Design a binder for this molecule. Sequence first.
Ligand SMILES: CCOc1cc(CC(=O)N[C@@H](CC(C)C)c2ccccc2N2CCCCC2)ccc1C(=O)O
Ligand SMILES: Nc1ncnc2c1ncn2[C@@H]1O[C@H](COP(=O)(O)OP(=O)(O)OP(=O)(O)O)[C@@H](O)[C@H]1O
Ligand SMILES: Nc1ncnc2c1ncn2[C@@H]1O[C@H](COP(=O)(O)OP(=O)(O)O)[C@@H](O)[C@H]1O
Ligand SMILES: [Mg+2]
Ligand SMILES: [Mg+2]
Length: 1171
Amino acid sequence: QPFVNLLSKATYWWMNTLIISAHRKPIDLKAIGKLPIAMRAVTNYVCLKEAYEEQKKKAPSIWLAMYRAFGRPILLSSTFRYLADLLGFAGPLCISGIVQRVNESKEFLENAHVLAVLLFLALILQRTFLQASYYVTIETGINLRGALLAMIYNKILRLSTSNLSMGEMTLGQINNLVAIETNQLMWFLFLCPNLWAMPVQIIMGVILLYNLLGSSALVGAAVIVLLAPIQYFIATKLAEAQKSTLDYSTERLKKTNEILKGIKLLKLYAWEHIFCKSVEETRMKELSSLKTFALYTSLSIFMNAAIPIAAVLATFVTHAYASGNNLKPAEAFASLSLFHILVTPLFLLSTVVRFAVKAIISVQKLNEFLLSDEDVAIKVTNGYFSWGSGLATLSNIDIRIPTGQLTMIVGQVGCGKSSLLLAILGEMQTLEGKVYWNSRYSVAYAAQKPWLLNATVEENITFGSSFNRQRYKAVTDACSLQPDIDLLPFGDQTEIGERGINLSGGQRQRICVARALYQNTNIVFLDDPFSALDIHLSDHLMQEGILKFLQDDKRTVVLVTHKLQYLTHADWIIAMKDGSVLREGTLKDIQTKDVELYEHWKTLMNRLRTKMPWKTCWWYLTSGGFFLLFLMIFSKLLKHSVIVAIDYWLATWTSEYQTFYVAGFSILCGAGIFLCLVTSLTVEWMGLTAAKNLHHNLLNKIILGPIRFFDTTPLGLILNRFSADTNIIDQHIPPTLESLTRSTLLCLSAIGMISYATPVFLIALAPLGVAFYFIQKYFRVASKDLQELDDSTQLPLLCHFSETAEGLTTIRAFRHETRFKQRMLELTDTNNIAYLFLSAANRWLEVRTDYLGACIVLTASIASISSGLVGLGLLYALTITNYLNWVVRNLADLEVQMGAVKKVNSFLTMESENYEGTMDPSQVPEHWPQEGEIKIHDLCVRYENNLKPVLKHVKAYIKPGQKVGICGRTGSGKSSLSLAFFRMVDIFDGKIVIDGIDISKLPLHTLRSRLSIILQDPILFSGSIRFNLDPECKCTDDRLWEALEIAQLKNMVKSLPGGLDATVTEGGENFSVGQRQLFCLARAFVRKSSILIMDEATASIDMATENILQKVVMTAFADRTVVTIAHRVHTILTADLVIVMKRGNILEYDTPESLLAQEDGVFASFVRADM
Ligand SMILES: CCOc1cc(CC(=O)N[C@@H](CC(C)C)c2ccccc2N2CCCCC2)ccc1C(=O)O
Ligand SMILES: Nc1ncnc2c1ncn2[C@@H]1O[C@H](COP(=O)(O)OP(=O)(O)OP(=O)(O)O)[C@@H](O)[C@H]1O
Ligand SMILES: Nc1ncnc2c1ncn2[C@@H]1O[C@H](COP(=O)(O)OP(=O)(O)O)[C@@H](O)[C@H]1O
Ligand SMILES: [Mg+2]
Ligand SMILES: [Mg+2]
C-alpha cells in the first residue's frame, strides 16, 4: 500500500486532481492547499538564521549556513541525478544491441525483445528519477528563497535610516536584492546538481564513445567538447550585451515614468512631443544593444546546432578513412545517440557555471548588505544625538512635552526641527543623555515626507486598526477628504501611492495626517502637516482636527510647523535653531522670558475557457513583414529536411555494409550548418523587428491620449505596459517562438521517420496521439492559470518590500514591525505556493510526456524487431521523448506571452484629441497673443460627459495687459477655470475668445504652446537646467539668465556646479519647494507669451518669498496679462479686476476696492480670515 504512495509522489499524482479538474474553475489560492508547515517561510527562515548564528558564534559565511540548512535535500537530488544519468546511458547500448541482433548463458540477455523491454523499463526509471531530482532541487531552492527573503526583510526593518548609511541609492539596492539577487541565488540552487552531474555525464559519454569507435570517437569528442568554451565565451558576451540593454531599459523606464507621472505639465506646456522624442532616442539605443544581444543569441543557437554536426562529420569521416572495417549500423547509431545525449550537457554546463558565478557575486552582495548599520509625556536630559558620522547634529537637547496637551516646535528651515522627532523615536544615535517616557509605547507619526501604502485609501487611513465607521467618518471629515475621495474612481477603495492612482501632494499629506489621527495611540508626532495643504485646508484641519479631535481624546500632540500664526493655540512651545532648543515654555511664558524671540516671531508674521489567441500571434508574426515570416518558415523547413537527410544518408551508408558516401555526407553537413545559421539569423531578426514596431507606436499612442485616461486609469497598468510587457516582447518571446518551432519540427520529423521505417507504428500512433492531445489540453490551461496566480501574487510581495523599505520611520514609530513581518511571511508563503505548484505542474507534464515517449520507444522497437532503418527509427524514438514535453511547455509559454502582446496591441488602439483643429494655418498670426485680450461668453465646462457642470455660464472679459486675481473656496472651479484656456476639460456651452480667435477651433498644440501656466504643486523634470528651461532649446542664454534673475534663482544657479547645465534630480527633489516654484516661474517666462495663468502658484511659499515673487512678477510682466488663482486673497489685493468663484459661479466681478466696499463681502471676509 505505501508503495502506492511512493508511486503517487514519483508521478506527481498528488496534483492530478488540481490539473485534470480546476481547468473549468480557475485555480485560486483557496483551491491550492496552504504550504506544509515544513516549507513555510517561517520554518526556513528560522533554520537559516540558526545556521547563520552558529557560524557567527564560530566567528560568518552565508555559504556554510546554506549548506547546513539545505544539504540533505541537495545530496538526495544529486543521487537521483546520478541514477538518472546512469540509467539514461542505457539508451545507446540498447540500440546497439537491438541493431546488432537484427538481421542475424547470456543468450537470453542478447534477445532483441529482451533488450527492447529493458530499454523501455530503463527509460521510465530514468525519467522518473530525473524528474524526482528536478522536483527535490526545486523545492529546496524555493525554501531557500523564502528564507532569504525573510532574512533580508528583517534586516530592512532593522535598518538605520541615516544618510551616511542609507542615503538615497540604498533603496534601489534593497529592491534589487529582493527582486534579482534572491532569484538568481534561487536559480543557482535550482541548477547546482548540474555541476555534479554534467561533467560526469560527459566523461561517461566520451568513454562509451571511445569504446565504440576507437580513435574516431576521441576526435569527435574533442570537437564536441570544444562546444563548452565557445558557449562560455558567447555567454559572457550575451551577459555584457544584456547588462547594457538592462541599463538602457532602466533609463527609458525612468524617463517614461517621469513623462506619464507629470503628464499634465507636459500637455499644458506642449512638451509631450519633445519628451517622447527623447524616450524614442533612448529606445533606439536600447534596440542597438538588443540587436547585439540577439545577434549573439543567434550565433549561440548556430553553434549549438552546428558544432555537433561538425563533430559527427569528423568522427565518421575519420572512421571511414582510418578504421579498417566499415561503419556497422549499430556503431553508427549508438554514436549518434551518444552525441544527442552529450549535446544538452555541454550546451548547459556553461550556463550552470555562469549561474554559479552570479550566485557567488550575489552572496557577496547579500553578505555586504546584512552588515549595514542599524503629566510629563517625554523627558530628554543633556541630549546629544548624531546621525551616525560622529558629528553632533543635535547638542544640549532638553525638552519636556506635557501629556494630553498640544505642543508646537518652531525653527528656521534647517534648525533641527524634523531631526529632533527622529531622535526621540530612537532613529538617531544617542551619544549622551537618556530619553525617558511615561522602551516606548507606539507613537502616531505623520512623516514630513508623506508615505502611502499601495493599498486603498480606507486601508491607509485605518492602517491595521479596527475599522470603526463613526471614527473613520469623523477623521475623514476633519481631514477635509470627503469630496476628494469621491473624486477618485472609487469613493473609498481606490488604489493609492506608487503603482496606483496618483494624488496631489496635498492629498498625500491629508491621507498621512488622517492615518496619524485615526490610531488610538496617545502620543502623536505631526511634522509639517500643513506644508502641502492650502490655507483654507490647514485652517479647517487645525480648527477641529487638532484643536477638537485630538483634545477630545486627550492625546499628546507634537506639531512641527513654521506657521507661527497658530502659536496662539499652543500650550507648550519649543524654539529650535542650529540644532539647539532656544527655549521651552508656554506662549506667555516664552514671551516674558524671551522678548527677542517674540519680536522675531512677530517679524516673521509681518503683522469560460480562453482559447489560444491566434489573431494576436499571427499579427505579431506578420509585424516583421510577410517576406520575413516566409523566409523564417521556409528556412527552418529546409534546415530540418537537410538534417533528416543527413541521418538518412548515414542510415543508407551503414546499410551498405566508401569514397562516394564520404562526399555526400560532407556536403549534407555543410548544407545543414549553413541552414542552421540562416534559420537562427532570420528568427532573431523577426523578433527585433516585431519588438521595435510594437513599442514605437505604443508609446506614441499612449502619450497622445487624453488627460482623463491618466486621471482614472491606475499608473500601475500604464507603466506595466512598458516595463514588463515590452520586456517580454523584446526578450522572452523570440526565444520561445524559436524553441517552439524547432521542437515541433524535430518532433514531426521523428514521427515521420519512425512511421517510414516501420509503417506499423502508425497503428500505435493513434492512442499516443490521443494521450498527447489530452495532456496538452489540460496542461495548457493549468499552466496558464498557475502563471497567472504566480504573477498576480508576486506583484504584492515586491510592492510590500518596496513600501516597507520606504518609510521605515513610520513603521518603527507606530511600532508595527511585527505586523509587517507577519504580512511579509503571509505574502511570501502565497507566492512560494504558487511558484511551487507551477513547478509541480511542469513536473507532472514532464513525467506524463516521458511515459508517453517511453511507450513510443517500446512500440517503435517492437515494430522494428518484426537494416539501418531500425536504428534510425530507434534514435528518433529516443529524441521524441526529449522534445515532446518541450513542445508542450514552449507552446504554453508562447500563449502566456502572446497574452502580453495582446495587451500591448489593445493599448495601441486608444482615443486621442483633435490636435489638428480647423483654423487656417495662415490665419494664426506670427505672435498670436500680441494684445493679450481675453473674452468669454456663457462658458460651461464638465470634466467628463454626463457629470455635473463645474462652470455655470460664466461670462468674463479682460482688457489687454490687465492683471486679475481669482480666489474662492476649494472645489469652486478655480483650477478648472484656469485649465479651461487649454481645453484640458470639455466645454459644453459658451466659448473663449482670445486675440479675436475662439480657442475651440484652434489646433490644440498651437493653443497650448503660446500660453504659460504655473501649477499649484511645481514639478521639475530630470535633466539639465537648460533642458527644463527650454527643451526646444530655442532661447539665447541671456534670456535664461534674465529669467533666473526674475525668478530670483540667478544666485542659486551661479552656485550650481555647472551653472547653466547643473544636474537636476527627478521631480526637482534636488532643490527646495521655493526654488522649484521660482524655476517654474522662469520656465513660464521663457515662453515670451502675453498671457500667464498662475493656479495657486505660491501655496508652499513663505510670506516674504511670496511677496517678493509677486512684486517681481508684476514688474517683469507689467505689460503681459496675468490671471492668478490666489492661494491667499491678501496676495491679489493689488489687482485690476478680482473674480471669486463659488460652486462654479463668479459671484463677484469688479475692482478689489469695489469688492471690498460691499459690506460683509465674501472676499472681505476672506481677507479678515487671512489677517
Ligand atoms: C523552475 C524549473 O526549472 C527547472 C530546473 C531544473 C534543474 C536543472 O537541472 N535544469 C537544467 C536542465 C537539464 C535538462 C540539464 C538546466 C541547466 C542549465 C541551464 C538551464 C537548465 N534548465 C533551466 C530550466 C528549463 C531549461 C533547462 C530542471 C527543470 C526545470 C524545469 O523547467 O521544469
Ligand atoms: N536623515 C538625515 N540624513 C542626513 N542628514 C540629515 C538627516 N536629517 C537631518 N540631517 C541634517 O541635520 C540637520 C537637522 O535637520 P532639521 O531637523 O533642521 O530638518 P528640518 O529643516 O526640520 O526638516 P525640513 O527642513 O524638511 O522641515 C539639517 O542640517 C540636515 O541637513
Ligand atoms: N478630473 C476630474 N474629474 C471629474 N471632476 C473633477 C475633476 N477635477 C475636478 N473635478 C470637479 O471640479 C470641481 C472643481 O475642481 P477644481 O477646479 O479642480 O478645484 P477648485 O475648486 O480649486 O477650482 C470639483 O467640485 C470637482 O468635483
Ligand atoms: Mg522637516
Ligand atoms: Mg483648484
